[PDB]
Design an enzyme around this catalytic site. Sequence first.
Site, PDB file in Angstrom:
ATOM      1  N   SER A  85       0.842  -1.184   0.000  1.00 40.05           N
ATOM      2  CA  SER A  85       0.000   0.000   0.000  1.00 40.05           C
ATOM      3  C   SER A  85       0.883   1.242   0.000  1.00 40.05           C
ATOM      4  O   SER A  85       1.901   1.305   0.697  1.00 40.05           O
ATOM      5  CB  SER A  85      -0.923  -0.016   1.209  1.00 40.05           C
ATOM      6  OG  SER A  85      -0.945  -1.324   1.758  1.00 40.05           O
TER       7      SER A  85
ATOM      8  N   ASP B 152      -0.345  -0.478  -4.712  1.00 37.12           N
ATOM      9  CA  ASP B 152      -1.789  -0.350  -4.562  1.00 37.12           C
ATOM     10  C   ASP B 152      -2.184   1.029  -4.024  1.00 37.12           C
ATOM     11  O   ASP B 152      -1.455   1.640  -3.256  1.00 37.12           O
ATOM     12  CB  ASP B 152      -2.307  -1.437  -3.617  1.00 37.12           C
ATOM     13  CG  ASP B 152      -3.828  -1.606  -3.667  1.00 37.12           C
ATOM     14  OD1 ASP B 152      -4.481  -1.111  -4.609  1.00 37.12           O
ATOM     15  OD2 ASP B 152      -4.374  -2.237  -2.742  1.00 37.12           O
TER      16      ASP B 152
ATOM     17  N   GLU C  71      -9.107   3.158 -11.759  1.00 32.21           N
ATOM     18  CA  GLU C  71     -10.431   2.851 -11.238  1.00 32.21           C
ATOM     19  C   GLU C  71     -11.438   3.924 -11.605  1.00 32.21           C
ATOM     20  O   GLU C  71     -11.238   5.103 -11.303  1.00 32.21           O
ATOM     21  CB  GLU C  71     -10.426   2.675  -9.717  1.00 32.21           C
ATOM     22  CG  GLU C  71     -11.729   2.056  -9.258  1.00 32.21           C
ATOM     23  CD  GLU C  71     -11.848   1.857  -7.760  1.00 32.21           C
ATOM     24  OE1 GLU C  71     -12.910   2.189  -7.186  1.00 32.21           O
ATOM     25  OE2 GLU C  71     -10.895   1.352  -7.153  1.00 32.21           O
TER      26      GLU C  71
ATOM     27  N   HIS D 199     -13.885  -2.827   1.397  1.00 28.71           N
ATOM     28  CA  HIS D 199     -12.776  -3.349   2.190  1.00 28.71           C
ATOM     29  C   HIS D 199     -13.274  -3.918   3.511  1.00 28.71           C
ATOM     30  O   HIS D 199     -14.328  -3.528   4.017  1.00 28.71           O
ATOM     31  CB  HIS D 199     -11.722  -2.280   2.438  1.00 28.71           C
ATOM     32  CG  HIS D 199     -11.111  -1.738   1.178  1.00 28.71           C
ATOM     33  ND1 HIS D 199     -10.541  -2.549   0.217  1.00 28.71           N
ATOM     34  CD2 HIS D 199     -10.921  -0.463   0.751  1.00 28.71           C
ATOM     35  CE1 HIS D 199     -10.069  -1.801  -0.769  1.00 28.71           C
ATOM     36  NE2 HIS D 199     -10.285  -0.531  -0.470  1.00 28.71           N
TER      37      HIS D 199
ATOM     38  N   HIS E  70     -11.496  -5.212  -6.474  1.00 32.88           N
ATOM     39  CA  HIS E  70     -11.079  -4.949  -5.115  1.00 32.88           C
ATOM     40  C   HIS E  70     -12.075  -5.570  -4.157  1.00 32.88           C
ATOM     41  O   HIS E  70     -13.134  -6.042  -4.559  1.00 32.88           O
ATOM     42  CB  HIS E  70     -10.941  -3.459  -4.891  1.00 32.88           C
ATOM     43  CG  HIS E  70      -9.767  -2.870  -5.604  1.00 32.88           C
ATOM     44  ND1 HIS E  70      -8.584  -2.576  -4.967  1.00 32.88           N
ATOM     45  CD2 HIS E  70      -9.580  -2.556  -6.907  1.00 32.88           C
ATOM     46  CE1 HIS E  70      -7.727  -2.084  -5.843  1.00 32.88           C
ATOM     47  NE2 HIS E  70      -8.305  -2.065  -7.030  1.00 32.88           N
ATOM     48  N   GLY E  71     -11.700  -5.608  -2.887  1.00 33.37           N
ATOM     49  CA  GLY E  71     -12.567  -6.087  -1.815  1.00 33.37           C
ATOM     50  C   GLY E  71     -13.057  -7.504  -1.991  1.00 33.37           C
ATOM     51  O   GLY E  71     -14.218  -7.799  -1.689  1.00 33.37           O
TER      52      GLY E  71
ATOM     53  N   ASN F  11      -8.010  -8.762  -5.641  1.00 35.09           N
ATOM     54  CA  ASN F  11      -7.246  -8.318  -4.475  1.00 35.09           C
ATOM     55  C   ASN F  11      -7.726  -9.035  -3.222  1.00 35.09           C
ATOM     56  O   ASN F  11      -8.907  -8.962  -2.880  1.00 35.09           O
ATOM     57  CB  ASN F  11      -7.367  -6.808  -4.314  1.00 35.09           C
ATOM     58  CG  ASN F  11      -6.672  -6.046  -5.441  1.00 35.09           C
ATOM     59  OD1 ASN F  11      -6.428  -6.595  -6.500  1.00 35.09           O
ATOM     60  ND2 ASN F  11      -6.364  -4.777  -5.212  1.00 35.09           N
ATOM     61  N   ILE F  12      -6.825  -9.749  -2.539  1.00 34.18           N
ATOM     62  CA  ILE F  12      -7.203 -10.509  -1.345  1.00 34.18           C
ATOM     63  C   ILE F  12      -6.248 -10.232  -0.188  1.00 34.18           C
ATOM     64  O   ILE F  12      -5.026 -10.447  -0.306  1.00 34.18           O
ATOM     65  CB  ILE F  12      -7.263 -12.014  -1.609  1.00 34.18           C
ATOM     66  CG1 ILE F  12      -8.399 -12.328  -2.597  1.00 34.18           C
ATOM     67  CG2 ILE F  12      -7.479 -12.723  -0.282  1.00 34.18           C
ATOM     68  CD1 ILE F  12      -8.329 -13.740  -3.221  1.00 34.18           C
ATOM     69  N   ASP F  13      -6.812  -9.780   0.940  1.00 34.51           N
ATOM     70  CA  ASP F  13      -6.029  -9.542   2.151  1.00 34.51           C
ATOM     71  C   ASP F  13      -6.780  -9.888   3.439  1.00 34.51           C
ATOM     72  O   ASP F  13      -6.165 -10.439   4.364  1.00 34.51           O
ATOM     73  CB  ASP F  13      -5.525  -8.104   2.218  1.00 34.51           C
ATOM     74  CG  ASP F  13      -4.545  -7.900   3.363  1.00 34.51           C
ATOM     75  OD1 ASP F  13      -3.474  -8.549   3.353  1.00 34.51           O
ATOM     76  OD2 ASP F  13      -4.860  -7.117   4.287  1.00 34.51           O
TER      77      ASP F  13
HETATM   78 NA    NA Z   1      -7.899  -2.329  -2.770  1.00 33.44          NA
END
Ligand code: NA
Lengths: 324, 329, 329, 324
Positions: free
Chosen positions: B53, B80, B139, B182, B216-217, B259-261
């Site tokens: 990030s 990101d 985006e 998120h 995302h998310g 996107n995976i966190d």
């Molecule tokens: Na993101």
Amino acid sequence: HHHMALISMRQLLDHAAEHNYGVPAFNVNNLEQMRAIMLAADATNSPVIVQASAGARKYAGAPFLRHLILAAIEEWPHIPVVMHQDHGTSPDVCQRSIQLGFSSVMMDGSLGADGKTPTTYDYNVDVTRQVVAMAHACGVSVEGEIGCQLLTSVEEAKQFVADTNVDALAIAVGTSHGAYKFTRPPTGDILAIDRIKEIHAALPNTHLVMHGSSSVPQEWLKVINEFGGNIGETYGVPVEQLVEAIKHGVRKINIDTDLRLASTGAIRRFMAENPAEFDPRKYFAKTVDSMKQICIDRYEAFGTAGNADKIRPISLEKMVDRYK
Amino acid sequence: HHHMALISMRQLLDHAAEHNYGVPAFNVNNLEQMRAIMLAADATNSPVIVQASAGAPFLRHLILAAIEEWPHIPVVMHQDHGTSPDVCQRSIQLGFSSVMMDGSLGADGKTPTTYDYNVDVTRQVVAMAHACGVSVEGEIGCLGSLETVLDHSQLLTSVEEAKQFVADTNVDALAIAVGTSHGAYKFTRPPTGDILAIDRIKEIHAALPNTHLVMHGSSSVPQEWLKVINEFGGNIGETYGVPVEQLVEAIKHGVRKINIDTDLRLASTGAIRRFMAENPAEFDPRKYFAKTVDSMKQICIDRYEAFGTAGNADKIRPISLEKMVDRYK
Amino acid sequence: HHHMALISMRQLLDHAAEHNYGVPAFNVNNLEQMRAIMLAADATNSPVIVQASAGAPFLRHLILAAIEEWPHIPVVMHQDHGTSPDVCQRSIQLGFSSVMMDGSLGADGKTPTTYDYNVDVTRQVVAMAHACGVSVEGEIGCLGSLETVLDHSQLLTSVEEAKQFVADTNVDALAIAVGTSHGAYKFTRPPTGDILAIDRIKEIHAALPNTHLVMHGSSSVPQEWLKVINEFGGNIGETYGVPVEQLVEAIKHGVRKINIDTDLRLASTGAIRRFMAENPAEFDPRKYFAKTVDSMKQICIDRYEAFGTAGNADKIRPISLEKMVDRYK
Amino acid sequence: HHHMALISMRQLLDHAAEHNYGVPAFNVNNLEQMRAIMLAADATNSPVIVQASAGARKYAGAPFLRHLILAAIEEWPHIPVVMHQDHGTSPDVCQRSIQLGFSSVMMDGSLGADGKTPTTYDYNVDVTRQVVAMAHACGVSVEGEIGCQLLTSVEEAKQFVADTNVDALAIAVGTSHGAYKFTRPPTGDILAIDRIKEIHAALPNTHLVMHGSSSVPQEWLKVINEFGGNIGETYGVPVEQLVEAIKHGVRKINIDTDLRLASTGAIRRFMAENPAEFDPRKYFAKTVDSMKQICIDRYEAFGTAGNADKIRPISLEKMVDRYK
Ligand code: NA
Ligand code: NA
């Protein structure tokens, strides 16, 4: 000068002797541990020993432990850093540490290649000499160990240093690894500070090393017990006694269990105080904070503080001229 | 002052399109997390996206170590949520092979933006990055829940403005808003088409059938990990993530980066919680950190396999960022 | 403080044996020389041996640059003519993946040695290097001319002592003496069997049919380059090198590494001499240094092809020096 | 402090102004050239600008020119080093230099992307602004150029710096690239030192740059002519005039042809004096020696000498705060 390289242990312990202080040695296993050590060394302006356990290579990957130390040197270029290989079990192990770029290695010749079996005095000198040869050719420092049996005698310390001349000798005076160091508060009959005096008085020019020297802080034991942990009555080596030992030639003090307890305590307390948080970064920050305080407590109590910028580094290349 | 052998994002997502798969994007966070990704990518022979990030030396050095230990795994290092061109340009100088200029939010990172502003900052970054071979993710449309304060119209990307945004900027990959957000609290119930507009992905794909889409998310928020957390001292209310089946559908419709966190955070927090209660006498952090590696690694393996990433690492002949410059002029 | 992705010499020469070829070993000297080798190895798809004779930062950095520009070419970095175990150990610390402990000469580098001394220093280096996966090249028998002050018996390696030396040390590669020497003045006439004992190679090979043989002093000393030098201001008397055909024969008999440097010096010195006379108004060094690259590169290409090195670079899956450790225990 | 990073050009030229000296800029193309520069900077204790020509990237490989500078910084950690991209022909070129790690770039906006065609004033400001934006975001310095036509006017220098605020402006006062700079010894009518004074007096805060400033030493021209070379009567800019120009705001002086002549002279003399030698290292050493002397002659005559250890480096990261 610049601290973009590591310094040898020998140089750093020579400084400890000249200015009558000791250096605590902390194990690095991952990123958060490396940051706590360095942040504490910055806070106290102390030079640093970071060690890699025999299993640190396997746990973390050899490129990662090389690259963690490189990152630390970048982020705090004003701190001298010894990268030390702890508890090498055979000459072949210490050689891989040298190839990886360590500036100091330990050949634990008191135990066999298996890492548990006590050894003949001859075996000890053989593998310790073996490692001394390949390390001093490079400028790399060597710590060896005599004694396991459990109490080091003066005469064999004198002869063992003569037969190998390691840069540092780890001696056995009744401490051990882990949190269960003593059933009661250690007195002179279970922590032989007097033998240190005797060994120092016999070898007033050799750097002595103490393994298993975590104090085991009681408040962290209580914190763990309250928040789901269960650690029976056990005790470590009080900081007061370790200070006396430095006045008598102890320059390297291995501390590992204290940082494990501080970390486990911080996570347990945080995970109970905030059971909805699941971001590891949130409690990882509360392990850096608690580990950092332990390292600060030692750097200051051991006189390590204030010495980082008094040290003019000597390259490992020039350290070859100190041996040959 | 060290050089990483990264591949560009554009190369990696072109391959995903040519071979009908998607790539999950994981965050580099520390040594344990970094090892989980690489070990999972090693076991599945998948190429890797790792994100940072927008200390700094440590993230660079974790990646360099990763490349050394697995030199056969292609690795994209992606910046990101870049909040301005100047941020992205510093990332380019640091050596990223991919940047996101998130033009849906302003330089403050929170205030939604005009279309005009979005195109301007995104064009700026495309210009300086494609001079380098570096990839650019943009985006149009704002992340956010469709149940829950932005307009509905803002949180859902429209087909017409995606077509116009891609024409005006030619990013390498486009992030679209279809109701993800998120964190773990993405949906109050299992997401259906009225709160997670998988059909809008389909619509956008058919309008832009050659542009790489980004989601995302997209943590699944696995219910089994919610249970382990609740059982061993945790308190996480009833919530739901993006089901794997829908992300698989989205890949058939042009989603190439997912996107995976949060899933990795849940896997770690659950693994430590289970272990600390199952073995209350242990205090060696390595003893339970070992379990975060295993459980994070399993999440990564599951995604690499379910997304078709597995088996492609050695089908990729890397192209240097110097050679990627010729693809743009 | 930088890491090179080298392959071990042992791996490379095992491949040469398995596929019946040899590898010419060139010296790294400067940027122009380093580029010639790599460009020639690129054009021929050959793996590379580059040597450094025992500033230091520049040789490390020329190689690191080389690996970056051609990451698909496997590269052995070999320390040539080590005069003592301590020298070799410092090379191991610097990151070499191969060292030569030249035990035929003493620590002074000139005085020939006892067999006993040779085995002792060579065993020492094998022990510490194989702990690392690093390869060790040794030498029994002394380089030197057979026409021209060492004994004939010393300058020619005997079968029996090669067998005994390899048994006592297990080096990865053995350097043998059969009448070659350093420099351009290797032979007064085209070498025949009584001054260049190709048959002794054959004899040694049949006695040690699985050990890799090394040939020092193996520049061909190309006559055409001698002419160009003499025509454009140079003065080089009548001399002769090792013909390519004999090195090709030697490869069929276990020679896997062929050390070449004088040829590159002659190619450069000729190229500059021809150009400086052909264009006496030019003074941009790059203008004629460009020709040293071309002419050195052609020499390297000729060797890679004539030695069977060409076409093997992508048949090699590198093995890390960490993984090479398991081959020795 | 430490010089393991490069310093910005802007910092170094600010130092030149504060202490009234100038810095010669030398081109690096290979290993021997880099060593001559650094050895001379060590001999005189001077900070260094090394530049890469527009074709240096193609000739040497981008990894090699990065790695030559890295090696130099390792071998002489006490010398501050600016790595400068000379004669960038388009914004896209300067951006690749920034990605490669240069700390200073030149956008030659006076000539088009073709590198030969003179351009409209508007075009100049456009590409120069373009590069200024992406470089100052990083801390990287920018040199731009106004004028090709052949003589720079005062008013357009003032306006061009206002429209772009480059860190340095290269001005045209009658010099040119190569050895054929003048048919006769240059006088005030072919080397307009007076326009420098005028431009400096109008912009007493901008760093001025001079291209094509090799002196072309006559003895090297003679040495070349004797040993097989043939260079007609041509002349450079005398060192005496370049010293005056530094007293009037010239801080960066590009010198390239002199090093080419010193190298070609040394090889020609050596190859004739020893026609049996064929080891390139033997005459390469006699190019390092002769190039090194030219660099020493300039560092001392330009006041660069003695300033390397007076400079406390500022990272390119902190240089962002100087622009935004
Ligand atoms: Na993101
Ligand atoms: Na040789």
